[PDB]
């Protein structure tokens, strides 16, 4: 409930509680990915979120 | 209600198909033949 996104200091937001069960459906349209630095570049490559 | 932890659902068939189409696009750069392995987050803040 208590979050600081965007590395914000001095302000923390409390997400108020919600009555009942929450259900939501969204589209996953894309990713944010990173490649490992360990190489062995000519061997294989691994990707992570 | 249910005593449970919050959970997120993804259909096995739909995620796989996309992965197969995506993994082929990386080989337009990383070369025709090579091994591409996927893995979860390395480490850091919870947001990451």
């Amino acid at each position: 409930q208590i979050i600081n996104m965007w590395q914000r200091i001095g302000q923390a937001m409390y997400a108020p509680p919600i009555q009942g069960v929450i259900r939501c459906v969204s589209n996953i349209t894309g990713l944010i990915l990173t490649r490992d630095g360990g190489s062995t570049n000519s061997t294989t490559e691994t990707f992570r979120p | 209600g249910d005593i449970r932890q919050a959970h997120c659902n993804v259909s096995k068939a739909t995620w796989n198909e996309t992965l197969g189409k995506v993994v082929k696009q990386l080989r337009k750069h990383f070369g025709n033949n090579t091994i591409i392995r996927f893995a979860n987050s390395s480490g850091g803040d919870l947001e990451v």
Epitope: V21, I22, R23 | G1, D2, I3, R4
Partner: antibody, heavy 134, light 103 residues
Framework: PQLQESGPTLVEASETLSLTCAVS??????????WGWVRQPPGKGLEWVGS?????????????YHNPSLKSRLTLALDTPKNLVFLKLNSVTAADTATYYC?????????????????????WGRGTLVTVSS | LTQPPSASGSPGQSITISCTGT????VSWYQQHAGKAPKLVIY???KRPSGVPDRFSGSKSGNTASLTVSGLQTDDEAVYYC??????????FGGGTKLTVLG
Amino acid sequence: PQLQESGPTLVEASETLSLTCAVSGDSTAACNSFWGWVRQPPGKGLEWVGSLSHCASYWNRGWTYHNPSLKSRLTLALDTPKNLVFLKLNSVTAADTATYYCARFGGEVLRYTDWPKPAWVDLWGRGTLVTVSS
Amino acid sequence: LTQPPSASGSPGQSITISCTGTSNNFVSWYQQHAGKAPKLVIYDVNKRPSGVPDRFSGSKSGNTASLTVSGLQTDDEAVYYCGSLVGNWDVIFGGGTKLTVLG
């Protein structure tokens, strides 16, 4: 907390038996217990009828439990604002003649895992005798 | 659930009635006076409800569940039924045990 049963004490065979419980001192909206019926045939043992509850989860609009044998011929209903319980039995026979009790079911109802689990009747009613004759 | 048909005892003695077929801990016992409505005397095995004397105690060993009444008295004469949750959400009752504290 008091449970008052009401309805016809004398019903003819093959007809529809209807009974209504009026709760006093508690809310049918309360998620702490289930509401249903338990019938006790004359000089015989206790038989479970069924119970339901509007307090639902994300995939349903409620929960309703029927006794496997009586399932086809019964319908369970709860009126939340009016705080009333209902029982309807279709195609009734003299074998269904019993003293019907308005029952409040306790158990793992307020905190369950997967589906809710009612196991015992904590609060009873005085009950009424319904005799089915052709 | 299988409950013994009858049970007897003198005032002050302790009676133990059994029940079998309970694989879970949801076992509960009831007391019904003849010509009256049933009243729940125990729940969740051993645990007691409000306004119920200490002398009523529930117990379950293996597949057998047991109720024990010590210090018998006139008001204890009734029919005692046991019940428990089974399967997914269904619940069943035993034949009940008739315990008499007659003269």
